[PDB]
Design an enzyme around this catalytic site. Structure first.
Site, PDB file in Angstrom:
ATOM      1  N   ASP A  12       0.839  -1.192   0.000  1.00  0.00           N
ATOM      2  CA  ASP A  12       0.000   0.000   0.000  1.00  0.00           C
ATOM      3  C   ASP A  12       0.891   1.265   0.000  1.00  0.00           C
ATOM      4  O   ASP A  12       0.775   2.089   0.912  1.00  0.00           O
ATOM      5  CB  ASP A  12      -0.912   0.020   1.258  1.00  0.00           C
ATOM      6  CG  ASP A  12      -1.625  -1.304   1.501  1.00  0.00           C
ATOM      7  OD1 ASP A  12      -2.016  -1.976   0.514  1.00  0.00           O
ATOM      8  OD2 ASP A  12      -1.807  -1.675   2.684  1.00  0.00           O
ATOM      9  N   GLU A 188     -11.453  -0.892  -2.966  1.00  0.00           N
ATOM     10  CA  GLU A 188     -10.671  -0.233  -1.906  1.00  0.00           C
ATOM     11  C   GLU A 188      -9.541   0.629  -2.503  1.00  0.00           C
ATOM     12  O   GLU A 188      -9.438   0.771  -3.733  1.00  0.00           O
ATOM     13  CB  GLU A 188     -10.131  -1.257  -0.897  1.00  0.00           C
ATOM     14  CG  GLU A 188      -8.978  -2.134  -1.415  1.00  0.00           C
ATOM     15  CD  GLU A 188      -8.654  -3.319  -0.524  1.00  0.00           C
ATOM     16  OE1 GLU A 188      -9.434  -3.640   0.378  1.00  0.00           O
ATOM     17  OE2 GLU A 188      -7.600  -3.951  -0.718  1.00  0.00           O
TER      18      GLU A 188
END
Ligand SMILES: [Cl-]
Ligand code: NA
Length: 447
Positions: A12, A188
């Site tokens: 991420d 997401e």
């Protein structure tokens, strides 16, 4: 070019380019227990920059577990870190949280907790990112809509301050498409890039396995970004697994910019193997990668495929036809403008196969295939190990023949005095005589 991967065991990724001459890089660590940060003057410097722990999970209660997906932003004189966190008492009650620092250096500065980003619905929430469109600040994030049978959908709201939304959220996407709902139904990791009067919001979809990929929503920068019908979802992923390059489940991306501010850079993670072993939350192998975003003629972004490890590939454009790039089609090399299949036109410059300080040009979408000549015609073909191929696929790198300073020209190694040149759009290796032949044989790498 970059050298991939940038960082092992960092998922991420988020990179912020500050006005202080530094890039700031944070990411999810496999322990999920804390927030790391490192800076460097260049994107590639980040590979060796030392990490500092700016914040560690709480011993008990909220912000005590599953410290996930931080972003760092500088806003109105201060630093803000957006992350997601569960509780010790409940590890899947994941909410959005904000840190604030007034110090010049966020590595050494002191941080205050601004608490939870409040939302009308109390449910699973993460992946908060912030952006400004037309001077108005927005938050976008991933959250469960309890009236849907899935994991997370995408929400956008305006902000009253860096840690507080104003008004009501609009849900702008939910996972419905076959490629969004593999393993889990997921939207997401939203990330915004703005270009040519448009706003592009890429997001991650499916489970974090080989099925992880990027979708995209598009809108006009003049549109009401809280009206769901402002946004158009792309029917197919904009970025997905490449078996050919050994890159699996690319996603959870953000965007930064090149050293000169001129190129947009895609930042994301992936794995170099397909099937995870063990509990996927526990598999720490996701790593951080960089590659330039190219812009289509219709002003949409073109992410291409996730590229092979090592140095990134390049594109070569013609001197006399500066819109046209060396690309392959049915494995024949040619020059063509507005290449839709972007990777057909990326090649990395490598140590020449034939030796003696020459160079070879490996295909980005077919690793181990190279631009090579046969009967003076240029193709993209598999290195078969032979000496012939070694020699047809090596060139002496020359100063451009129509541009000595900035141009590049490729002189055959086994046919000296024959150069790579386009003729009738197709690439050949031919002797260069007229001023026009010298333009036909001059190219630019990355302009
Ligand atoms: Cl094309
Ligand atoms: Na993010």
């Amino acid at each position: 070019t970059f050298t991939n991967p940038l960082a092992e065991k960092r998922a991420d990724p988020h990179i912020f380019k500050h006005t202080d001459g530094y890039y700031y890089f944070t990411a999810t660590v496999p322990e999920y227990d804390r927030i790391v940060l490192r800076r460097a003057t260049t994107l590639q410097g980040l590979a060796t920059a030392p990490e500092t722990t700016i914040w560690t999970k709480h011993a008990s209660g909220v912000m005590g577990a599953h410290i996930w997906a931080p972003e760092i932003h500088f806003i109105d004189g201060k630093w803000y870190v957006y992350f997601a966190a569960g509780s010790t008492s409940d590890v899947w009650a994941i909410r959005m949280y904000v840190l604030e620092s007034g110090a010049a250096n966020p590595l050494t500065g002191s941080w205050t907790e601004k608490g939870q980003i409040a939302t009308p619905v109390s449910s699973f929430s993460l992946d908060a990112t912030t952006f400004v469109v037309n001077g108005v600040r927005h938050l976008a994030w991933a959250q469960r809509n309890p009236a849907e049978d899935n994991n997370t959908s995408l929400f956008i709201a305006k902000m009253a301050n860096p840690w507080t939304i104003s008004g009501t959220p609009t849900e702008i996407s939910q996972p419905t498409l076959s490629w969004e709902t593999v393993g889990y139904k997921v939207n997401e990791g939203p990330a915004v890039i703005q270009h040519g009067g448009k706003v592009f919001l890429t997001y991650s979809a499916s489970a974090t396995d080989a099925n992880y990929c990027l979708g995209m929503l598009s809108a006009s920068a003049s549109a009401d970004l809280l009206n769901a019908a402002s946004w158009t979802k792309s029917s197919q992923p904009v970025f997905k697994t490449s078996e050919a390059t050994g890159q699996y489940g690319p996603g959870h991306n953000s965007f930064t910019v090149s050293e000169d501010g001129k190129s947009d850079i895609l930042v994301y993670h992936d794995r170099n193997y397909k099937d995870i072993s063990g509990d996927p939350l526990n598999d720490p192998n996701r790593r951080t990668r960089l590659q330039k975003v190219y812009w289509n003629a219709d002003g949409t972004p073109n992410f291409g495929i996730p590229v092979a490890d090592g140095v990134t590939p390049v594109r070569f454009s013609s001197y006399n036809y500066p819109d046209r790039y060396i690309r392959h089609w049915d494995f024949r090399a040619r020059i063509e403008a507005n290449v839709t299949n972007l990777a057909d036109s990326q090649f990395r410059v490598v140590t020449g196969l034939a030796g003696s300080g020459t160079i070879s040009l490996e295909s980005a979408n077919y690793p181990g295939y190279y631009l090579r000549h046969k009967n003076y015609e240029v193709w993209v073909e598999k290195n078969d190990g032979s000496s012939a191929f070694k020699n047809d696929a090596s060139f002496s790198r020359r100063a451009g023949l129509a541009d000595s300073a900035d141009g590049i020209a490729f002189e055959s190694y086994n046919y000296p005095g024959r150069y790579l040149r386009h003729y009738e759009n197709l690439l050949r290796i031919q002797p260069v005589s007229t001023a026009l032949d010298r333009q036909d044989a001059t190219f630019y790498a990355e302009k």
